[PDB]
């Protein structure tokens, strides 16, 4: 397993997506932050597994910008996989679209083209943290690890994680109108 992530150092994302990585980046803080308050927690000035607490169980709005990025250079580094391979990314259409109710993407149908775009998307997911696990390794010593194959070797259960993220930003990219293509 030889994983070649694509580079994304000098991809520049254009100025007018600037929008959509800030609704994206809330859109996935709310996700997180449901989940969590469905679970009992609440805001803490510090992180606490037992008492259940988080600093960040607050809007997205309030954060700083350094928390902000947390969740907008994830979402910059797909983009930019994106536009790396040539894709592109339009505004076509209108959108479609503490107590964070998230917007519910289970109704979003993704055709099979963006689903096959979700793919590629999902390889390079793999690849990346295989590439960054195999210089993690060695740093520490050596080792292996048994998700270190080519993403096709997967099974299903374990291109999983990599296929929801995929899919979850093709389904907001849609959702706010937006026409993705290659």
Do not use: C
């Not at 479609?96 to 998307?121: F, H, W």
């Not at 740093?139 to 899919?167: I, N, S």
């Amino acid at each position: 397993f030889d994983p070649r992530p694509v580079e994304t150092l000098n991809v520049i994302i254009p100025e007018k997506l600037d929008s959509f990585i800030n609704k994206f980046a809330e859109y996935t803080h709310k996700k997180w932050a449901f989940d969590k308050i469905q679970n009992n927690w609440s805001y803490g000035e510090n992180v606490d597994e037992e008492l259940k607490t988080h600093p960040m169980l607050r809007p997205y709005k309030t954060f700083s910008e350094k928390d902000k990025e947390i969740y907008r250079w994830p979402i910059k580094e797909s983009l930019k996989a994106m536009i790396a391979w040539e894709w592109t990314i339009e505004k076509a259409r209108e959108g479609e679209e503490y107590n964070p109710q998230p917007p519910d993407l289970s109704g979003v149908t993704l055709s099979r083209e963006l689903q096959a775009m979700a793919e590629q998307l999902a390889e390079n997911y793999h690849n990346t943290w295989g590439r960054k696990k195999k210089q993690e390794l060695e740093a520490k010593g050596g080792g292996t690890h048994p998700l270190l194959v080519p993403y096709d070797t997967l099974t299903a259960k374990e291109k999983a994680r990599d296929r929801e993220k995929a899919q979850e930003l093709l389904k907001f990219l849609q959702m706010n109108g937006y026409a993705v293509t290659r």
